Design a protein around this ligand. Structure first.
Ligand SMILES: C[n+]1cn([C@@H]2O[C@H](COP(=O)(O)OP(=O)(O)OP(=O)(O)OC[C@H]3O[C@@H](n4cnc5c(N)ncnc54)[C@H](O)[C@@H]3O)[C@@H](O)[C@H]2O)c2nc(N)[nH]c(=O)c21
Ligand SMILES: C[S@@+](CC[C@H](N)C(=O)[O-])C[C@H]1O[C@@H](n2cnc3c(N)ncnc32)[C@H](O)[C@@H]1O
Length: 259
């Protein structure tokens, strides 16, 4: 049993109150409420992000873990946070997002942030039932949580299988959600994939403690085992002391206009 698995076990064993305190203990959070007021008022200007995702991707870019450029594919784009953020980057020329939509799933949001005209979000698409196509930047944020670490592992594995085909067209720059990187098989498969395609795992502090999600990005390079175990150490450590205050931040502004 690995540290992450012990973390998952401890997590599931927690009482609901303890879990409420723990999920956001000491994490970085972005203020979103003005963005929700504006978005539900139908304000397409003002440069509001459609989701929290834009803050995540930003965190990865501003620290040089990936450098988006050219044609960007966003698998599981959802509302389009990653896509709309990617549209604001200089070297990025075109952004194409794909999401499942329908019952239980997010629909694409139309907004006129900077570079909205080079963005196209397609809904009603199963990326698993979709032929891969060439791209400079490969983004993927698929990985639904589960109380069962085995289910999370299986879903993550299916995701990696799916993104293999896109990666063999060889970008470039990529960022891929790894929901469950804390099992033995997962870490070994990630070692393999890291030797084949490069890149490394990175924990984003905007992530909640209730998820062990890490991001496989091209501009990172690190021992998978060590970074995963470091993350696990952080999450484990945050279960013992008092509740650490939330570090609130300003949400990313994506401006307005076309390109
Ligand atoms: C609500 N919840 C979630 N988790 C754990 O957190 C992980 C990720 O959770 P999340 O990041 O999706 O966000 P959160 O759960 O806070 O809210 P959301 O609505 O997004 O998640 C709902 C999911 O939580 C899970 N869940 C609900 N109640 C419990 C519970 N009593 N024990 C374990 N898992 C639960 C269900 O699978 C459900 O699909 C889950 O895989 C689960 O093991 C919990 N653990 C305890 N001990 N008590 C909880 O109440 C709890
Ligand atoms: C939570 S989102 C990511 C957030 C998004 N990047 C943003 O910044 O707004 C992940 C999305 O992937 C979508 N998804 C899950 N499985 C999918 C599949 N098989 N095909 C297409 N989209 C899927 C879900 O609907 C979900 O909205």
């Amino acid at each position: 049993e690995t540290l992450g698995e012990k973390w998952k076990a401890r997590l599931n064993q927690m009482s609901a109150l303890e879990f409420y305190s723990y999920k956001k203990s000491g994490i970085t959070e972005v203020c979103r409420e003005e963005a929700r007021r504006a978005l539900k008022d139908g304000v397409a200007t003002g440069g509001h992000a459609v989701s929290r995702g834009s803050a995540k991707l930003r965190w990865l870019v501003e620290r040089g873990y990936l450098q988006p450029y050219g044609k960007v594919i966003d698998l599981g784009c959802g509302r389009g946070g990653w896509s709309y953020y990617a549209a604001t980057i200089r070297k990025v020329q075109e952004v194409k997002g794909y999401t499942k939509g329908g019952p239980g799933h997010e629909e694409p949001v139309l907004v006129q942030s900077y570079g909205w005209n080079i963005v196209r979000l397609k809904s009603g698409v199963d990326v698993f039932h979709m032929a891969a196509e060439p791209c400079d930047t490969l983004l993927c944020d698929i990985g639904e949580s589960s109380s069962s670490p085995e289910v999370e592992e299986a879903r993550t594995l299916r995701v990696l299988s799916m993104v293999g085909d896109w990666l063999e067209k060889r970008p470039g720059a990529f960022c891929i959600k790894v929901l469950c990187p804390y099992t033995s098989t997962m870490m070994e498969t990630l070692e393999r994939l890291q030797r084949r395609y490069g890149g490394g795992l990175v924990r984003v502090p905007l992530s909640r403690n209730s998820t062990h999600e890490m991001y496989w990005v091209s501009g990172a390079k690190s021992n998978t085992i060590k970074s995963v175990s470091t993350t696990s150490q952080l999450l484990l450590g945050r279960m013992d002391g008092p509740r650490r205050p939330v570090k609130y931040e300003e949400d990313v502004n994506l401006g307005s206009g076309t390109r």
